[PDB]
Design a protein around this nucleic acid. Structure first.
Ligand SMILES: [Mg+2]
Ligand SMILES: [Mg+2]
Ligand SMILES: [Mg+2]
Ligand SMILES: [Mg+2]
Ligand SMILES: [Mg+2]
Ligand SMILES: [Mg+2]
Ligand code: NA
Lengths: 114, 177, 79, 152, 66
RNA sequence: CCAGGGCUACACACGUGCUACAAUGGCGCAUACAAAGAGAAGCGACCUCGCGAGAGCAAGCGGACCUCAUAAAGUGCGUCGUAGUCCGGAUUGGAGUCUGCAACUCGACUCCAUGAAGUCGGAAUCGCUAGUAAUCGUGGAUCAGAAUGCCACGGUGAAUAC
RNA sequence: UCCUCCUAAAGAGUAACGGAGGAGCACGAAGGUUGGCUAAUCCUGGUCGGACAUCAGGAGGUUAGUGCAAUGGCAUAAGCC
């Protein structure tokens, strides 16, 4: 149980244990496991170490924790420097896809401040 | 050791023909390596200084000396005698071993490494460098550590100028710019 | 976001670009077209768009290609 | 008046105790047989009886240093248990100062405050934070236990 | 040295993942396997591979299927 | 009369709602049962392509025949074993689909990833007496496109009223 | 009542309701001896770290220090282990 960042979850199914990687969800985990030749119902601590090595390269053909964060930060920092409308909303801390800020948008704003 | 006899056999000749000296010992030689950090946050958590001392003992095979504040300064609310930092001086065989094991493995393990600056000399052939984090060193298992404490490496050579210090350090395959 | 084929712009600005590219950099173009995307034959220009009441001269840099002309003309003043 | 205040590290929600059957015994017929009960994050349930019934051994079974003859107790996966024993002599030993005893606890706290401050909030001074732990008397030992609970 | 105040010190084989056997004294207690050393570090080979974050006209052109 | 913008602005407050905080539940597999209504510059099977929104071809129907249109809770099998979790779905990055001259302001929907607050809610306050409350789905108008709203239909189906 | 400087006129002393500050202690080591060491403050280089923490070189040199006010003294240190 050791993948790019960390595969902390033992005692869990390999399909959901792989979700701990920043960049793999549910379908990607199924895509990873299907090409690994192992069933989706096997527990991480039960599968042999002859498949974890075959998983690290299968995880490696995607974008994952260490470098995915940098990639998306470059995308946001681009718009901030670009001066786009999304950049202005990203700089202020408001919704960027054009929804209500009259009453909603507490998720993007945070707790109220009188 | 390996870096020491590499220096003896090759660097002496290289620098001698480079600078057109006249004596065997006119070539600059590195005389010591100092590794320190002033933890600063030992005002209230004296165990932090012990943890840093253990980190330095693991990194280099010596027991660190605990350095105390020389003069009371009211800006950082410290006074005389407060243990503030830790320091280790390496000379000879241990200095050469650490010199090998730093620039062969520890520097490559730097996240997004690009190169050490060449204008970081104090004007007398001395070099200084900040590793910014203690996790890169192979003596650390990335899980025992608890903080982001970093060292301050200082290479003290007998060079008479920053030019000769640059030449000596570039003779040892330093990753400059 | 728009359609699979045919990136949509306005003719009156497309023809105005072809006159500007030959003459090079000049006085800014006062165009009301906001719904027109940017093409590589406009990089480095000084086109001006409408925010509702006045024209703001924008400088088309390298990265502003897929975006639209109105994407850099905020239309409401806040604080 | 010693200012003592018990905080909460992590708040558990559903229920805590949920014990089914203990039937603990030492020499005679078990002092109790079933004692099936729930907690529901309530308050107290002040166990009581007469001298020699076995309330202390019931608490020992609940806290787990003594296990029943056959049964299940279990706690919530987020449950953090502070324990103030009826007799506490296994604690005040090994010849530590008051400061050292009170500092052997604590999760992430500065050595000079938040541990020398919890001592002063309960009737202690500089002339007392250096006397040995194994010499305080009665109520002072109890107050030290309260302090360890406040920090845990 | 000063007679057992220090940690231990011994020779440990520290080879790369691409060969590169390097016997270095250290204080770990176990042989270790790590990434490339500066001998095979990707520093002089990715000088332009690292400076590649960019490109919008090129990815707009491929979108211009018409 | 025309183009562009606004009605969509946000330190905040109130009213009406939707989705939840889970285990009489999520998820995967297989299998049942409805009512009502609309459709001609409109509903558009079947087949092929696409993981999917959808695209190509395209009969039938201005209709008890043809399309919308697979109803969903349910039932049986397995797993998850009370964790901020295989609950939750906000927000954000990337890639797209279709109406439309035109999607930045400011559409809907699909895919990959991220995946927050929330673990039954203070003073106070609202609805309901039977096929009702609760709960699950379906359709229509306005409509090029654009509802968690409005109007309407059925499935399951209570407790209590001294 | 006691201590330090000036008035006090280059030996000592010298008054005023003349000009300025302190004391009624501390220490079982802050005493004895042996061995060892030299400060303030500025420059550059350096991870958090900033004008100022700690590290390395340079200048400077006693401008630091002396349990406590001032005067005299102190490197052979009377200063620091
Ligand atoms: Mg309105
Ligand atoms: Mg005289
Ligand atoms: Mg005289
Ligand atoms: Mg003395
Ligand atoms: Mg002496
Ligand atoms: Mg003396
Ligand atoms: Na008892």
């Amino acid at each position: 149980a050791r993948i790019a960042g960390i595969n902390i979850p033992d005692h869990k199914h390999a399909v959901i244990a792989l979700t701990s990687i920043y960049g793999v969800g549910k379908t990607r985990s199924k895509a990873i496991l299907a090409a690994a030749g192992i069933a989706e119902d096997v527990k991480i601590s039960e599968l042999s170490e002859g498949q974890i090595d075959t998983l690290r390269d299968e995880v490696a053909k995607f974008v994952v924790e260490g470098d995915l964060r940098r990639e998306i930060s470059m995308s946001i920092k681009r718009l901030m420097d670009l001066g786009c409308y999304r950049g202005l909303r990203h700089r202020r801390g408001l919704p960027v896809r054009g929804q209500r800020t009259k009453t909603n948008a507490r998720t993007r704003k945070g707790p109220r401040k009188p | 050791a390996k870096l020491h006899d590499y220096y003896k056999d090759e660097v002496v000749k290289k620098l001698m023909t480079e600078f057109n000296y006249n004596s065997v010992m006119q070539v600059p030689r590195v005389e010591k390596i100092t590794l320190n950090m002033g933890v600063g946050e030992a005002i209230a958590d004296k165990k932090l200084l012990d943890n840093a001392a253990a980190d330095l003992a693991a990194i280099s095979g010596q027991k660190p000396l605990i350095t105390k504040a020389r003069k009371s300064v009211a800006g950082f609310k410290i006074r005389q005698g407060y243990p503030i930092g830790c320091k280790v001086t390496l000379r000879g065989e241990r200095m050469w071993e650490f010199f090998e094991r730093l620039i062969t493995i520890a520097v490559p393990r730097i996240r997004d490494f690009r190169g050490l600056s060449a204008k970081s000399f104090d004007g007398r052939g001395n070099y200084s460098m900040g590793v910014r984090e203690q996790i890169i060193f192979p003596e650390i298992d990335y899980d025992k550590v608890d903080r982001v404490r970093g060292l301050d490496i200082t290479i003290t050579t007998t060079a008479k100028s920053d030019e000769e210090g640059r030449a000596l350090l570039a003779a040892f395959d330093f990753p400059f710019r | 976001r728009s359609l699979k084929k045919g990136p949509f712009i306005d003719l009156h600005l497309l023809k105005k670009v072809e006159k500007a590219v030959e003459s090079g950099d000049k006085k800014p173009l006062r165009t009301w077209s906001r719904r027109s995307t940017i093409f590589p034959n406009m990089i480095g220009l000084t086109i001006a768009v409408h925010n509702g009441r006045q024209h703001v001269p924008v400088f088309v840099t390298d990265e502003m290609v897929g975006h639209k002309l109105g994407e850099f003309a905020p239309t409401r003043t806040y604080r | 008046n010693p200012f003592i205040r018990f905080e909460q590290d992590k708040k558990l929600f559903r229920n805590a105790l949920e014990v089914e059957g203990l039937t603990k015994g030492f020499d005679n017929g078990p002092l109790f047989k079933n004692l099936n009960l729930l907690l529901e994050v309530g308050e107290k349930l002040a166990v009581l009886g007469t001298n020699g019934v076995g309330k202390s051994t019931l608490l020992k079974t609940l806290v787990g240093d003594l296990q029943p003859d056959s049964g299940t107790v279990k706690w919530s996966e987020n449950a953090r248990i502070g324990y103030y024993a009826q007799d506490h002599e296994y604690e005040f030993e090994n010849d530590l100062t008051v400061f050292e005893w009170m500092s052997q606890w604590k999760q992430e706290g500065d050595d000079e405050q938040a541990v020398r401050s919890i001592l002063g909030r309960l009737l202690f001074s500089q002339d007392d934070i250096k006397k040995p732990a194994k010499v305080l008397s009665g109520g002072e030992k109890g107050r030290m236990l309260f302090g360890k609970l406040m920090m845990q | 040295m000063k007679k057992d105040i220090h940690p231990k010190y011994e020779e440990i084989t520290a080879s790369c993942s691409c060969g590169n056997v390097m016997k270095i004294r250290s204080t770990v207690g176990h042989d270790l396997n790590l990434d490339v050393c500066s001998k095979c570090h990707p520093f002089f080979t990715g000088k332009q591979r690292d400076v590649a974050t960019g490109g919008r006209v090129d990815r707009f052109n491929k979108r211009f299927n018409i």
